[PDB]
């Protein structure tokens, strides 16, 4: 075992080949899957994984009445295999958990699992499943952080946490976690700026996260960090606007963008010096579609013009969370990070009329070589029995 | 594969981190889940499992119908791994047991499992898996022992069982093992005391075992003894009665207090010089509601006064049986044997209008970072379909 | 990895220490169990093992439609863990079958299985699961082997096959098997014996086989044989009469005991000089309960006394098939072979008002420590669903 | 690990061992099984394994509904021990696939999954589960592959896929790949050719598929090359035509046998100088039966005289596709690469009345010891619950 180096480069792509998909939905019409929700991938030197909350409950039974806002004392986090179902009966227990994240640093998992009160909320930090540390909320207001991978670089792991308002400016945190131990952290000075379920990875020794503003923004807020933890904070410049909801395109803002700004989704992209690949919805209003635009000067310039778009969800069918994953060049042989990414497809509750919700999920990799466009939708047919 | 030292002391700790939920119950009204009583968490230097009886009958099935005790031929031990729902598809065999102990002395596992008739039961010991010994009834009163781990110093493992009345004076031994093999048995000396279902730990090359007075204590009885067997005993002296049922706290007794002393409940404490750590349900009467409270001269002292408390089960929600496990540092990593602990949440017979009765399980770990008390119960929906 | 030595003798026992119990038939009233006949325990120097014939059927399905004694081309031998119940999502496929053995060299698994027509049916022999001979009936007349374990000495394993009639005399053959490969077989010059699912261990370097006389025999067969096939015949002369059917116990033969000798059931006994232990039904006429006996002189002396009785199941309690298996010194660290032996309790056609036939097992291991009497019965309550 | 040699020659085999059936289609009518169609066997040095496309749908349940050819966005290639049912819980996912190959070159799984639209399918390579290349569509007119495992010789694996029409001239390549990197291709000159489906083996350092002739061939097209993709092409001259649907048996041809040639069945044969090996249906007009001739000039001369039939499934049994599979020496230990075959059952809709289409397998190795023709047939009872 040897720590990842996190030193080289994001793979430069011109597209993305598909890696996965699991059909859970679908599958737990009839088979023991769990109700899920914020799935998100994250890999090891040696395997890549999809970790999740689950409710403790099953697909097309009684206990999956429940809603997409739930931080109830049921959920767990686990994790499976990329691309099985995930059942009790192929499901590694991470932790007890609302809101989570994992990463692998080359020698073992950390994983970070929230539970507890809004009003005190606790962090469990295990590391190769051995508690090794806790932090509590110091804002007393939904201690909260990404639902997608943290990012490691030479045996520190890396990664944000939010607590205070949803709706309006709230407290961001960015902590440096050595064998599951926090070892630094700093409160990111950004008045009048919001981070949500930030999607960070590492490039070139540094961490980017690329985040969600629930609070005023229809594009996406970014923080990138070394590792002592000094930071810079902006928001995505262009035009094409990241968030859901969000204005339809036109010119972009360095700030927050007001316009359809408050609420949101969990997302992502890939910041390539001036340019960027957006990964987004493909409705303004709803959580429907989803597709990836490499926009050449997108990080720092505001029009509205882009170089490729490649279609991954079709406008009519249901999409959702999105995040970054990566694989390091320990686990694949190349001389560059590969960017990644996941989408979350949800189902149920509220936009059907079923008494739960759930998700599937499908995954990409960034490549140089020849891809193409489709649709790759949930595929179930609600409502289930027990609806 | 080293034996684990058990020389360390027990770590200092200041509060308890949410270690581990399975949503057994929730998950067993769809999926495969046995009927499970008992289960207790024990820990190899290299992962930590969960060990129950069930009687070879799965939730919302007709064999599931059962009575609140019962010794039958049909009663297994098994283990999966914590956190995860107990399957026949992710389950291992242990032993045919209706009473049983386990515990890894750092090369392999030992497994106490109790069959047979009440007049003449016998303990099958296993050391990785192969018969090593086996001890026969001596008082031909349902032979019966921890229903949690047993304990281990430098490759010698201890346990208590007993043999006699659960409502008088009774016969209790305590038992040093190595490679599964018995090598030496006392019999206490203990007139006016009753000793059931110890919950044992190492603490610095001793083993403290805190039990069930199921005749006539309210509060717990104390054994320890050295790895040559020589024991002390006691009763735990706080006015934070430990047992359920029990009486209000007041004032304590380092004997057995008799008020509300009859029956009891499966139950663990951690000794710190004159102080304790006490795990308990909320309500005095019923098994609801899980409590930690740390009362600084509580070993000794018998005063009612305690420095923290903090909540794990509301007292209106189930609870059950609990028990101490370990992780000793050969596991961790650290300098101190870090005491964690289980809580089984009964559903079920005979509080609830069901044919059955089985337990879901919450487990914590002891830290000296931030931590928070709430409510984590069982949260299944009874009664069930075949109810 | 190590060729078994095969060289010690059996350990002498007093007694008999419950092993493992699955359960099968009361899980698969839910859960997902294969119809299973023919249980058989066999050990590698590392782990325990149930084999099995499945008819690719799970209990409570339509599927599980049986005739209750039939050579289908769906039969197949599996394999699961030992004290699991035989689902399709723990057993390892091992053979196309519906006639079976299986045994391990101390380096990789041998499996033999039988399939295809009557009248010209082929064992397939595998070694670490690659098809490494084949050998085809040579009488024309149900080819059948020991639906329990071949028996290993010094790198290679050795086995009984039977072709001819079930009702008269027929042709009994014996193999030397190295690597999966038949290296030497002989021909048992046997006139007016008969050998059906014979039960062999290994002992001193030699292999000792219990078998049933399905023609006209109530006492068991015997043949042992050294590394060379140079064997040895003969019946078990003790008056305690081993065979079900068999008449009431009284003066034994060293021949077949023709009274109520017709018909049988698979079994086993254990040698120890001129003593024998003996498994055995309780009932004299039926597949009801099982008992091991402990007769001195009983090998060779055809007295109806016995010095040890130890019940397993009760008379009112439906058994079935029982066999042999062994611990080598390589997976125990004793100096001697160590003797166990499992029951297959059979439950529904054609004793129960069911349209299926299926069974659990229970195991046990020789010991000389204290044991117990007891009942451990199949435990289903019939009929089911499907039914 | 070591790359597989693959320099020896095809062992000589007189018959067929049955190797493995795995009861899917039988099992799934209660417990948790894919829907799957085109399974096929491949073997790494250490074990072999039924790779098999699913739609995300389990057998008994709704989203079972479906058309009888299609490719969706639904469809992924997973894989799982040979002879257990394909379950999402023993199931490994490989790819997102509506078309497939896979192959061990000896250090890892090559995977190839081609998804995305009609008008221009990629096909994603995986080495050890990492995206490693993708090829586009060169005709726009559905690329698709073998549907059986692709063949490996001294570290280079080698495939065929076709573009164009199914029912004209296509377009078949020919690919050389190392660590799932193609690293050459070649388009055939194979004019009044049709290739689909290629059954492709190594043999003497050299590559041989046959194929399906959708076009105008009732006998199959074959292409031999070397690892410069230097080729030969032909067809199997045998008047013992291959294909399904095919006339009866009379004077074959050494090109495409236009009568009844339209249309055709996924198949393979073995050639052995100027013999070979057939393994085709019963029916000349329908995927029904099963059976392997051995014709001693069948690869180069066109009458229609056989040495050996060997029957598999019955002309009255469904059956379906078939392919080849390998053992190379460093698997089993022989001095020769050892042919194998599977053949795929297929139940259900068009031929039966259920909503749902699905199969089940068997496999066989090449022997020269004895063997027996018989009749092993998938054995469900249709129509299924969900119908
Ligand atoms: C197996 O699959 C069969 C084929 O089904 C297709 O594939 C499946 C897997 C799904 O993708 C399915 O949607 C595909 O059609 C399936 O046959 C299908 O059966 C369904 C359900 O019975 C039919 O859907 C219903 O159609 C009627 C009639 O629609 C026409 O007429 C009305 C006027 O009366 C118009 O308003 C429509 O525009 C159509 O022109 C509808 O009345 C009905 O609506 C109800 O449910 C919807 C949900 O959207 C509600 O919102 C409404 O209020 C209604 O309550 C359904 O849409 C479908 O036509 C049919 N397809 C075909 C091709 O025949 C078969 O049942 C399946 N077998 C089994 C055993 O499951
Ligand atoms: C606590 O015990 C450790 C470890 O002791 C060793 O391992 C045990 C399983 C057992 O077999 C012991 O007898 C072994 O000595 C002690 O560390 C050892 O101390 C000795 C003497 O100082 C030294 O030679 C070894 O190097 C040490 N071994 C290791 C692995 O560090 C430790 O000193 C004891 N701590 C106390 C008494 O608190
Ligand atoms: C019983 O056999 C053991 C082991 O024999 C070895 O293992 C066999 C499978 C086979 O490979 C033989 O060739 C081996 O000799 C005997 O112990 C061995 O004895 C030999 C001869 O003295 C000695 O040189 C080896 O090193 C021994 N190996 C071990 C591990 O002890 C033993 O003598 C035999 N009989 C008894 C009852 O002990
Ligand atoms: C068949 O191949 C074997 C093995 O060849 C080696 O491994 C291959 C995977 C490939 O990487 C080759 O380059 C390797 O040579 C041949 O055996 C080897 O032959 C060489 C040359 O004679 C010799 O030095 C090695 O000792 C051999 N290795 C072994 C394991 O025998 C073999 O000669 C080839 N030819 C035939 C027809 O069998
Ligand atoms: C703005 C981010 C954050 C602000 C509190 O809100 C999130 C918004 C959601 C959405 O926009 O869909 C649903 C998320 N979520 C997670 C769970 C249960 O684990 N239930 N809701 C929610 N997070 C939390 C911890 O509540
Ligand atoms: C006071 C200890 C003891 C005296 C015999 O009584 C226990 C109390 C129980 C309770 O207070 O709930 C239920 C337990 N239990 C276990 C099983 C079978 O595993 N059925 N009942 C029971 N144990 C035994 C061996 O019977
Ligand atoms: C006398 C032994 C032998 C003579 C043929 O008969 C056995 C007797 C049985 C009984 O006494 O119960 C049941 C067995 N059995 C095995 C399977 C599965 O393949 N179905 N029945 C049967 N074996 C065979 C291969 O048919
Ligand atoms: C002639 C080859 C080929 C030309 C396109 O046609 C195949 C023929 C089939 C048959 O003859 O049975 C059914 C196959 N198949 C597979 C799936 C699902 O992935 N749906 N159809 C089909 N393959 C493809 C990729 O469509
Ligand atoms: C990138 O880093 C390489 C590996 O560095 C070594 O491994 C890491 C995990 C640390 O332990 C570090 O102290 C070691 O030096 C370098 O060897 C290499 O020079 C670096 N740069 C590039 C782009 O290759
Ligand atoms: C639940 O169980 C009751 C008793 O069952 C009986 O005892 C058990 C141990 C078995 O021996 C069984 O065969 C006996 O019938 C029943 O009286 C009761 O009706 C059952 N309850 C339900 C709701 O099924
Ligand atoms: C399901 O959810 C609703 C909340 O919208 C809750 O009030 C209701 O009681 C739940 N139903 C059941 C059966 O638990
Ligand atoms: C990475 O971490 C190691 C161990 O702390 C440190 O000594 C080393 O200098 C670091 N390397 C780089 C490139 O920062
Ligand atoms: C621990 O066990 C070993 C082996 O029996 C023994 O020699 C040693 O003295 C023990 N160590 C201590 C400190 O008790
Ligand atoms: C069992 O199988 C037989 C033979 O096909 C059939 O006649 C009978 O109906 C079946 N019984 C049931 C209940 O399915
Ligand atoms: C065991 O087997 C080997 C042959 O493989 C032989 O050389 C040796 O003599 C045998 N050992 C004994 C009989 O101890
Ligand atoms: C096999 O591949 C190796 C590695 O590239 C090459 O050097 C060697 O000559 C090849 N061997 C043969 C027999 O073709
Ligand atoms: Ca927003
Ligand atoms: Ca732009
Ligand atoms: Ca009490
Ligand atoms: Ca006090
Ligand atoms: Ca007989
Ligand atoms: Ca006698
Ligand atoms: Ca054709
Ligand atoms: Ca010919």
Same mark, same amino acid.
């Given at each position: ?24 939905? =679908?599958?737990?019409? &009839? ?10 991938? #994250? ?27 739930? =931080? ?111 070892? &630094? ?175 599937? #999920? ?26």
């Amino acid at each position: 075992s040897v720590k990842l180096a996190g030193n080289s480069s994001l793979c430069p792509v011109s597209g993305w080949a598909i890696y996965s998909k699991d059909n859970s939905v =679908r599958i737990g019409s &009839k088979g023991d899957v769990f109700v899920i929700r914020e799935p998100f991938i #994250s890999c090891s030197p040696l395997e890549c994984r999809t970790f999740f909350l689950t409710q403790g409950a099953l697909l097309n039974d009684k206990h999956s009445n429940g809603t997409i806002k739930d =931080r109830s004392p049921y959920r767990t986090l686990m994790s499976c295999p990329i691309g099985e179902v995930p059942s009790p009966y192929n499901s590694r227990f991470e932790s007890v958990a609302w809101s989570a994240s994992a990463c692998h640093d080359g020698i073992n998992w950390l994983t970070i699992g929230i539970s507890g009160p809004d009003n005190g909320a606790v962090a469990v930090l295990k590391y190769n499943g051995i508690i090794t540390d806790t932090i509590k909320s110091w804002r007393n207001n939904i201690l909260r952080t990404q639902e997608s991978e943290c990012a490691c670089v030479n045996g520190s792991c890396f990664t944000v946490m939010t607590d205070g308002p949803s709706n309006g400016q709230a407290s961001y945190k960015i902590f440096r976690i050595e064998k599951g131990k926090i070892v &630094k952290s700093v409160e990111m000075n950004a008045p009048n700026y919001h981070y949500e379920e930030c999607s960070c990875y590492p490039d070139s020794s540094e961490i980017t996260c690329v985040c969600r503003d629930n609070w005023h923004g229809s594009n996406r807020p970014w923080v990138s960090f070394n590792q002592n933890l000094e930071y810079q904070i902006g928001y995505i410049c262009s035009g094409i606007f990241g968030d859901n909801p969000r204005p339809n395109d036109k010119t972009g803002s360095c700030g927050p963008v007001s316009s359809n700004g408050a609420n949101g989704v969990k997302g992502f992209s890939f910041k390539y010096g001036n340019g960027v690949w957006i990964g987004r919805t493909k409705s303004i209003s709803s959580r429907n579609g989803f597709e990836m635009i490499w926009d050449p000067n997108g990080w720092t310039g505001t029009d509205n013009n882009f170089s490729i778009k490649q279609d991954i969800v079709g406008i009519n069918e249901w999409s959702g969370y999105s995040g970054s994953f990566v694989q390091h060049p320990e686990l694949t042989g190349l001389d560059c990070i590969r960017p990644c990414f996941w989408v979350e497809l949800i189902r149920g509750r509220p936009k059907e009329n079923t008494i739960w919700t759930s998700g599937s #999920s499908i995954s990409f990799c960034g490549v140089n070589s020849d891809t193409v466009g489709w649709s790759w939708p949930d595929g179930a047919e609600l409502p289930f029995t027990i609806d």
